Amino acid sequence: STGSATTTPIDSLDDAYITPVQIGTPAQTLNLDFDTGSSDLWVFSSETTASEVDGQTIYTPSKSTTAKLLSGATWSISYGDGSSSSGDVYTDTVSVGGLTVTGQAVESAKKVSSSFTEDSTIDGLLGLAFSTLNTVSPTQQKTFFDNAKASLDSPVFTADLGYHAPGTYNFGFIDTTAYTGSITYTAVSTKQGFWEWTSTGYAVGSGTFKSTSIDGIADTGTTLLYLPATVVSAYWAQVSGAKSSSSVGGYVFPCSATLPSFTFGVGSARIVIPGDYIDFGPISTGSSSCFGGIQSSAGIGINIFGDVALKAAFVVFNGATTPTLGFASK
């Protein structure tokens, strides 16, 4: 089998992407944030504290003839941005782009933190990291991909995120029309439960490529590109007036600037992030200070190849017995 679903930016900045997901019988379609940096499929629901729901579409398990309470199971998750959610668990039928999994753990939120409430466009998350990170207790549950894998034509999914435009998540096949040139594959460590890999270096604008190993994670659920302070300083040094602002929480730059591109290495291959992808607009409405899309990972404890980086590429998440990651230009 295969599946193919369009993923759509939630706003004009590509802060995140939502993909429609069918849950239950009859189908209830919720727009979920597909997150290769976590491993829980959780939704706003009829069980979510009412004051914490503001415009989201909810899953109502009592209206699904295929929903079953997973007795005794609870979940609780905290994300890198400080947001969190928790609740109980149902199993139900879940379909993405025509690919159906029966018996998928659907984690129903009883509580969500303010940032989730405040974002009316995201109805929950669909985790695509390794199932070892799944938070369901006392019986850990599998991700949608893990459950689907054996049925797929090939044990892969691909992320093709758009810049200020829709893109695609495919399951079970590689669309050879969706990228240019060849796909370069690189090794993955699953030791921390992430799609963790080592970039071979970087360049800033038209500058020379610096060969240096940068360990990080391919994380569709993180907006920005978080890299070592040395790398980030080298980038922003090429933008007149750019500075790190502790009050704002990162590098800012004059909105009048033209940003240079940023290149990262994948083996001997190179992925170029155009400068415009690195512009996240005014820090506050009407400001002429703009927020940068490349930020320091210092104090995160890990480098993160988030959407800023991934959307410059066609990315293969290869879930074969020994997982790997592939990157192509597009």
From Swiss-Prot:
It is an enzyme of class 3 (hydrolase). The keyword Signal applies. GO terms for molecular function: aspartic-type endopeptidase activity. It catalyses: Hydrolysis of proteins with specificity similar to that of pepsin A, prefers hydrophobic residues at P1 and P1', but does not cleave 14-Ala-|-Leu-15 in the B chain of insulin or Z-Glu-Tyr. Clots milk. GO terms for biological process: proteolysis. Its EC number is 3.4.23.22. Disulfide bonds join 255-290. It comes from the Eukaryota. Keywords: Aspartyl protease, Disulfide bond, Hydrolase, Protease, Signal, Zymogen. The keyword Nucleotidyltransferase does not apply. The active site is at residues 35, 199. Residues 17-328 form the Peptidase A1 domain. Belongs to the peptidase A1 family. This is Endothiapepsin.
